[PDB]
Amino acid sequence: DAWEIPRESLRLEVKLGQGCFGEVWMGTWNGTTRVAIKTLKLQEAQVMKKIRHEKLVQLYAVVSEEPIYIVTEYMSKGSLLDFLKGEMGKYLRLPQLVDMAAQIASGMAYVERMNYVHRDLRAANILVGENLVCKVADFFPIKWTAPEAALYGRFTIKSDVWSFGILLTELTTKGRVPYPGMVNREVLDQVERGYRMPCPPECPESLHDLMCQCWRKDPEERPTFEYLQAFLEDYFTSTEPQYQPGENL
Ligand SMILES: CC(C)n1nc(-c2ccc(NC(=O)Nc3cccc(C(F)(F)F)c3)cc2)c2c(N)ncnc21
Secondary structure (H helix, E strand, O other), rough: OOOOOOOOHHEEEEEEEOOOEEEEEEEEEEEOOOEEEOOOOOOOOOOOOOOOOOOOEEEEEEEEOOOOOOEEEOOOOOHHHHHHHOOOHHOOOOOHHHHHHHHHHHHHHHHHHHHOOOOOOOHEEEEEOOOHEEOOOOOOOHHOOHHHHHHHOHHHHHHHHHHHHHHHHHHHHOOOOOOOOOOHHHHHHHHHHOOOOOOOOOOOOOHHHHHHHOOOOOOOOOHHHOOOOOOHHHHHHHHHOOOOOOOOO
């Protein structure tokens, strides 16, 4: 396969993250190319190679023979989650946050067009680069999972939409865990009983509406990412043209 490079062309410099199955390292490829490298202790490619969009983290190369390595572009800001609760958090406002959201929706829209599913969409799985560039990446997270998928394993792009809705709460709360003061169990019970998170403080009701649309009980009622992208891209003109900066949003 033409993605295959030789291990030798990889210099694993700094370390970046630790996981259940392996690490992630800052690295150098062919001496001149800065890269991120995920490690193990090759099916995570069947579809990662076919994927190509400016808002999805780009694969660069693989090394199949164990230990399987993986080279992707480098995101200089780490996960959206760490970014949100980091020092940058306090400076981020609605416009910056709606723009990141839009970008993510854009990528998910591409996934949508390709008839793919993500299954685990959430801030932790979003990577940030220079100039607030956000890219979808790396595909139990019950609090992020649509009911039909959690209960009956009905995973679809529509359940991905659900997660997007939950992801919007992360952006608007600067990275707080959703359903505060609730454990996974009572989340299931409540959500199935129609409970939903309320409009976050300083968040415009129009944006909470969008969330609620994403959390509709019937997967088919949920908007497409194509709608979501367009909605957010246009947000401050067609939806909230009277937006005034607040203390946090
Ligand atoms: C936060 C730290 C652990 N980290 N992690 C990465 C990173 C490296 C590899 C991956 N792998 C990955 O995204 N695999 C994958 C598998 C299936 C589908 C996809 C998708 F197309 F959706 F992006 C992606 C994810 C994050 C990464 C990076 N590129 N640049 C800077 N820091 C990084």
